[PDB]
Design a protein around this ligand. Structure first.
Ligand code: CA
Length: 184
C-alpha cells in the first residue's frame, strides 16, 4: 500500500548500515505508536533477506505493579523512572548485547502481575532488535548502533501518567533529534 513501502524502505536503510559483529537496532516510540507491530514486521522482512534477527520487547521487562503503582510519587515519575529497573537492565541486557551467547531474564506477565525466567539466545544473530518506550535514555543509548524513532500524532489519569512522562522524555532526551531515522 504505502506503509508497506515505508517498511521496505526502512529495511533497505538497515541493510545499508556498516556492520562490525552484531548490529543492535532500536525502535523507539511512545505508547501505542505501533512500535511492536513495526518491529515484528521489520524483523520478519529482514529474515527473508537472509538476516538472523533476535527481538526484545521492553514491555516484557517491567517491574511488578507494587513497584510502579501507588508508590506515592506522581504517575509520570513512576512510569518513566520506576517502571523499568534501568540499572539492572543496563547490566543484564544492554551491556550484554554485543558478546553474550544467551540471556536469562524475568519476563513480566501483565495479567498475573508475576515474572518468570525465560531464556533468549543471541548466539549467531546478525542483528538484535529492541523496541519500546524511552529507549534513548542516557544509560541505554551507547549500546544501540541504529535507532528509529516512530513519530505519531479517566482522561486525567492518562495525562498524569502517559502524557507527562512523554513530555518529560521529549524535553530531557530529545529522542526525535537523537534518532538516526525518524519514521513519520
Ligand atoms: Ca542461530
Amino acid at each position: 500500500m504505502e506503509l508497506r513501502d515505508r517498511i521496505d524502505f526502512l529495511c533497505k536503510t538497515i541493510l545499508a548500515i556498516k556492520t562490525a559483529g552484531r548490529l543492535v537496532l532500536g525502535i523507539d516510540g511512545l505508547s501505542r505508536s505501533g512500535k511492536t507491530t513495526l518491529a515484528n514486521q521489520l524483523s520478519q522482512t529482514l529474515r527473508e533477506q537472509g538476516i538472523s534477527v533476535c527481538v526484545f520487547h521492553m514491555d516484557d521487562h517491567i517491574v511488578e505493579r507494587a513497584k510502579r503503582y501507588h508508590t506515592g510519587n506522581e504517575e509520570w515519575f513512576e512510569y518513566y523512572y520506576l517502571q523499568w529497573d534501568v540499572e539492572w537492565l543496563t547490566h543484564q541486557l544492554f551491556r550484554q548485547l554485543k558478546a553474550s551467547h544467551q540471556l536469562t531474564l524475568p519476563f513480566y506477565d501483565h495479567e498475573t502481575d508475576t515474572h518468570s525466567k525465560r531464556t533468549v539466545y543471541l548466539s549467531d544473530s546478525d542483528m538484535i532488535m529492541i523496541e519500546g518506550v524511552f529507549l534513548q535514555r542516557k544509560e541505554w543509548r551507547p549500546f544501540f548502533d541504529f535507532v528509529v524513532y516512530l513519530d505519531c500524532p479517566n482522561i486525567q489519569k492518562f495525562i498524569n501518567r502517559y502524557w507527562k512522562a512523554e513530555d518529560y522524555y521529549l524535553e530531557t532526551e530529545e529522542p526525535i533529534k537523537r534518532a538516526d531515522v525518524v519514521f513519520d
